[PDB]
Design a protein around this motif. Sequence first.
Motif, mmCIF file in Angstrom:
data_model
loop_
_atom_site.group_PDB
_atom_site.id
_atom_site.type_symbol
_atom_site.label_atom_id
_atom_site.label_comp_id
_atom_site.label_asym_id
_atom_site.label_seq_id
_atom_site.Cartn_x
_atom_site.Cartn_y
_atom_site.Cartn_z
ATOM 1 N N UNK A 12 0.795 -1.235 0.000
ATOM 2 C CA UNK A 12 0.000 0.000 0.000
ATOM 3 C C UNK A 12 0.827 1.286 0.000
ATOM 4 N N UNK A 13 0.107 2.407 -0.164
ATOM 5 C CA UNK A 13 0.684 3.731 -0.361
ATOM 6 C C UNK A 13 1.552 3.682 -1.655
ATOM 7 N N UNK A 14 2.404 4.667 -2.002
ATOM 8 C CA UNK A 14 3.139 4.625 -3.269
ATOM 9 C C UNK A 14 4.332 3.657 -3.170
ATOM 10 N N UNK A 15 4.072 2.339 -3.131
ATOM 11 C CA UNK A 15 5.110 1.314 -3.019
ATOM 12 C C UNK A 15 4.830 0.149 -3.967
ATOM 13 N N UNK A 16 5.903 -0.542 -4.379
ATOM 14 C CA UNK A 16 5.888 -1.601 -5.389
ATOM 15 C C UNK A 16 6.729 -2.780 -4.895
ATOM 16 N N UNK A 17 6.189 -3.527 -3.933
ATOM 17 C CA UNK A 17 6.849 -4.655 -3.287
ATOM 18 C C UNK A 17 5.742 -5.646 -2.920
ATOM 19 N N UNK A 18 5.991 -6.963 -3.048
ATOM 20 C CA UNK A 18 5.036 -8.066 -2.855
ATOM 21 C C UNK A 18 4.225 -8.315 -4.132
ATOM 22 N N UNK A 30 2.958 -14.346 -2.780
ATOM 23 C CA UNK A 30 4.139 -14.149 -1.952
ATOM 24 C C UNK A 30 5.025 -13.076 -2.609
ATOM 25 N N UNK A 31 5.885 -12.371 -1.844
ATOM 26 C CA UNK A 31 6.902 -11.481 -2.393
ATOM 27 C C UNK A 31 7.997 -12.290 -3.098
ATOM 28 N N UNK A 36 14.426 -6.491 -2.313
ATOM 29 C CA UNK A 36 15.167 -6.604 -1.052
ATOM 30 C C UNK A 36 15.517 -5.224 -0.463
ATOM 31 N N UNK A 37 14.486 -4.520 0.000
ATOM 32 C CA UNK A 37 14.553 -3.214 0.643
ATOM 33 C C UNK A 37 13.196 -2.754 1.174
ATOM 34 N N UNK A 38 12.185 -3.634 1.181
ATOM 35 C CA UNK A 38 10.789 -3.258 1.286
ATOM 36 C C UNK A 38 9.991 -4.534 1.558
#
Length: 39
Positions: A12-18, A30-31, A36-38
Amino acid sequence: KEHCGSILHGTWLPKKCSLCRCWHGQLHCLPQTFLPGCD
């Protein structure tokens, strides 16, 4: 009525992980070192 998973972003929010994949019965969601930072 499905033959796999889908797409995600357990972030969630402005993020691109998982993520997920779509396979016939392998890997739901799954991620898997996706960023590898989030988580």
